[PDB]
Amino acid sequence: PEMVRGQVFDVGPRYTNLSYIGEGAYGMVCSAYDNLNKVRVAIKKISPFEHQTYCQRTLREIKILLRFRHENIIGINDIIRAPTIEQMKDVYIVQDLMETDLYKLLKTQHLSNDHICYFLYQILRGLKYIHSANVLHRDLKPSNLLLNTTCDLKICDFGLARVADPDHDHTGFLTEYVATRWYRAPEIMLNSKGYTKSIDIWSVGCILAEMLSNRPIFPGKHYLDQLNHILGILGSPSQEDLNCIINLKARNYLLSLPHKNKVPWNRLFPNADSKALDLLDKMLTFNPHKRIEVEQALAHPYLEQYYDPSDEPIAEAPFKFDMELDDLPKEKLKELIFEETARFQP
Numbered sequence: 627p628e629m630v631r632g633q634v635f636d637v638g639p640r641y642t643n644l645s646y647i648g649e650g651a652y653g654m655v656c657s658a659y660d661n662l663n664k665v666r667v668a669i670k671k672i673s674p675f676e677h678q679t680y681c682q683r684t685l686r687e688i689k690i691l692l693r694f695r696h697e698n699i700i701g702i703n704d705i706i707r708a709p710t711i712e713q714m715k716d717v718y719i720v721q722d723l724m725e726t727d728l729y730k731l732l733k734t735q736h737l738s739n740d741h742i743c744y745f746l747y748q749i750l751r752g753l754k755y756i757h758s759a760n761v762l763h764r765d766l767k768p769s770n771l772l773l774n775t776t777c778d779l780k781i782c783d784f785g786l787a788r789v790a791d792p793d794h795d796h797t798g799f800l801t802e803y804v805a806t807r808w809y810r811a812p813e814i815m816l817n818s819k820g821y822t823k824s825i826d827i828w829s830v831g832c833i834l835a836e837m838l839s840n841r842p843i844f845p846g847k848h849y850l851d852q853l854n855h856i857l858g859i860l861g862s863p864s865q866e867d868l869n870c871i872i873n874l875k876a877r878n879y880l881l882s883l884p885h886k887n888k889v890p891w892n893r894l895f896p897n898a899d900s901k902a903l904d905l906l907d908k909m910l911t912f913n914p915h916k917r918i919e920v921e922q923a924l925a926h927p928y929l930e931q932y933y934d935p936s937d938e939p940i941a942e943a944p945f946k947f948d949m950e951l952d953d954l955p956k957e958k959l960k961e962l963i964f965e966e967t968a969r970f971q972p
């Protein structure tokens with residue numbers, strides 16, 4: 627097999643002329659020339675089979691992406707693996723080759739208001755499709771937002787996704803860990819398992835803020851610090867919002883804090899479009915029941931140049947319940963991954 631950085635990257639002969647482009651969660655990512663479609667592609671190598679949790683994440687993404695088809699979600703073009711379960715050690719997922727991602731872009735590039743609006747529209751258009759399938763992405767962040775050379779935007783990585791379950795979302799204080807710290811909604815730390823759609827809207831609000839200033843708006847230094855940054859900008863929650871938190875440990879923690887004033891968005895972002903800040907405020911609302919939903923966000927005046935509900939499609943076949951992947955040993959999950967990837971074999 628061809629080798630990259632001393633590691634097996636066994637994708638031939640269809641995919642040739644390999645170049646290393648970064649790291650995925652269970653392996654490296656390369657670009658490669660697709661000799662059938664005569665275009666270069668991205669290929670991520672996955673090596674999950676020694677751990678049940680890795681197999682779960684891999685199966686999850688494959689099942690979701692083989693059902694999804696949407697312009698703002700990066701799909702699966704091909705899956706490469708050995709012809710037998712016995713020989714299958716790695717799995718390679720082939721996807722469109724993009725130019726960059728929003729994390730890399732925001733390191734050095736200031737966005738015009740027109741770019742911010744177009745990027746946000748595309749994020750919400752893809753998220754509408756995701757949520758219409760009864761799915762939660764649960765790890766939206768700049769490095770999961772890919773851009774091509776004409777600034778078409780696509781959402782990456784469904785390995786952390788879940789089927790929505792709002793009736794079983796309540797839990798205890800300081801126990802849950804959903805999403806990446808800076809993009810994690812306050813209720814994750816207070817009383818939520820991250821099983822409702824409002825978890826994703828919070829992450830999009832964080833991304834919008836970062837597009838406006840090229841800095842993360844809530845840069846917690848560790849898990850427990852994140853709520854400090856959120857409350858330092860939103861200020862103390864209202865009585866009504868606290869009454870919506872029945873869990874005593876969570877509510878009493880908030881009640882034990884000194885009063886904090888809200889910091890006005892236009893003081894944090896004095897050059898921002900005021901319509902953008904109105905939408906930002908609605909996405910970064912403390913109470914998840916009052917937080918704007920994806921279809922409302924698409925209809926907000928900030929996005930009026932793009933909004934077109936008849937061109938904002940929804941999923942044909944929503945996921946009705948979660949895949950019940952837990953308690954499945956890694957051997958059964960390897961079998962399921964093998965079966966789900968069979969459609970790509972010659």
Ligand SMILES: *[C@H]1CC(=O)[C@@H](O)[C@@H](O)CC/C=C/c2cc(O)cc(O)c2C(=O)O[C@@H](C)C1
Nearest residue numbers: 647648649655668670722723724727769782
């Ligand atoms: C999507 C997630 C990411 O893009 C991010 O996690 C990144 O750090 C992972 C490594 C690089 C991905 C990448 C890089 C370039 O230059 C072009 C691409 O198309 C991709 C890509 O498609 O990444 C997918 C596989 C993961």
